[PDB]
């Protein structure tokens, strides 16, 4: 298991979780509601908006421990955004899985990370054979 | 209790609050300096001409 | 039944300590401040 | 006469000096600080009975 | 079986990926690199976008199946951002899977994507207890 947080700020379309322990660490959710027309039909669209951030204290020099080194702390953030049809949420998972595994391949096992793109990673849609 | 959560609010609101005010600040600091230093090159001018 | 309020006054002021952590960010925060200024005031003979 | 002739240089000099005197006792004055808050819990134990 | 695809445009940035098959849905992996000197440590910034596009039709009218009645696709778009320093890929990797496991919970589990919220979401944060 991990940490659990605890919702600090709520709102009808704003709710933000952070670490008791750590009040750095943060989970922000907001979600846009709107209403799209299409072609004769009209369309309820959500986006849903997602920010985790960590502060954090990046390389510790080569491999010692000691006190007087309390190097500047960075921030990490990942940021996610998604946007579709309300009823087409059963499909919009399924792509959502598929970006999930997507992303893994380039950069969880990839050095996406790093800064380098591998053009023959193997990329897969949401559709199956 | 719904009172007690709507209360935070007041924090981000005294903290625009204090942008505006330094953000004022600096701007009458930067007038008094800008001042200052076209004073000082009339006077400069003046005084060689 | 319950302890006594004094003694939980007691152990809690016995309890009680700095945070070693937040002592060394708040720190690390303070020194680039004022290397920051250091910096900044690095110029002031430059203006006299 | 010639006495009062003397603002041509007395104002301004010294304007000019409670300027540099401002502009850096502002700078000098800076009073910096620095602070952080925490929510870390204190446990007691309870006896079981 | 989901279905490969091969790249279509490559950059020295990015890198987009479309089906052969359908090429309305993509994938693109764009990414911005950046050197810093916060600490007297070089600190290199790597953010990528990373935007998957998949434009399926409109749901067909409930309880009706002509064969082909035609609907305007509505766009389904999740955009990802991961921003950090290149020396954390060790740790970075670390609360993307809570990141993933975090909105799991409250969307994918949930029912975010339906406009919704709840406080009570059980999230969990990346440091461990």
Redesign the interface.
Same mark, same amino acid.
């Given at each position: 298991?991990?940490?659990?947080?605890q919702?600090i700020?709520?709102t009808?379309?704003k709710?933000v979780?952070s670490?008791?322990?750590?009040?750095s660490?943060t989970?922000s959710?907001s979600?846009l509601?709107q209403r799209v027309k299409?072609?004769i039909?009209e369309?309820?669209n959500?986006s849903?908006q997602?920010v &985790?951030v960590?502060k954090?204290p990046?390389?510790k020099?080569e491999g010692c421990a000691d006190a007087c080194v309390?190097?500047?702390?960075?921030?990490? &953030?990942?940021?996610?955004?998604?946007?579709?049809?309300?009823?087409?949420?059963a499909?919009?998972?399924a792509?959502?899985?598929?970006?999930?595994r997507?992303?893994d391949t380039?950069?969880?096992s990839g050095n996406?990370?790093?800064?380098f793109?591998d053009?023959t990673a193997?990329?897969? &849609?949401?559709?199956?054979? | 209790s719904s009172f007690l959560?709507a209360l935070?609010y007041l924090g981000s609101l005294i903290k625009d609050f204090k942008r505006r005010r330094f953000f004022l600040n600096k701007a009458h600091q930067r007038i008094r300096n800008k001042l200052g230093v076209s004073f000082a090159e009339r006077r400069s001018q003046i005084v060689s001409k | 039944t319950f302890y006594s309020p004094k003694e939980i006054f007691n152990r809690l002021k016995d309890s009680l300590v700095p945070d070693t952590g937040l002592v060394?960010?708040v720190?690390?925060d303070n020194?680039?401040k004022r290397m920051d200024f250091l910096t900044a005031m690095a110029e002031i003979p430059q203006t006299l | 006469s010639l006495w009062l002739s003397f603002r041509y240089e007395i104002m301004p000099l010294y304007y000019q000096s409670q300027d540099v005197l401002d502009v850096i006792a502002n700078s000098t004055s800076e009073f910096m600080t620095s602070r952080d808050?925490?929510?870390?819990?204190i446990n007691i134990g309870i006896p079981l009975e």
């Open positions: 298991a991990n940490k659990p947080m919702p700020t709520s009808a379309n709710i979780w670490d008791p322990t750590r009040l660490t989970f959710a979600l509601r299409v072609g039909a369309l309820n959500v849903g997602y &985790s960590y954090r990046a390389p020099p309390i190097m500047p702390n960075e921030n990490q &953030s990942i940021r996610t955004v998604i946007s579709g049809s309300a009823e087409n949420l499909t919009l998972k792509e959502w899985e598929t970006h999930k997507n992303v380039l950069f969880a996406a990370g790093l800064g793109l053009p193997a990329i897969v &849609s949401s559709d199956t054979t | 959560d935070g | 060394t960010q720190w690390a020194n680039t | 808050f925490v929510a870390k819990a």
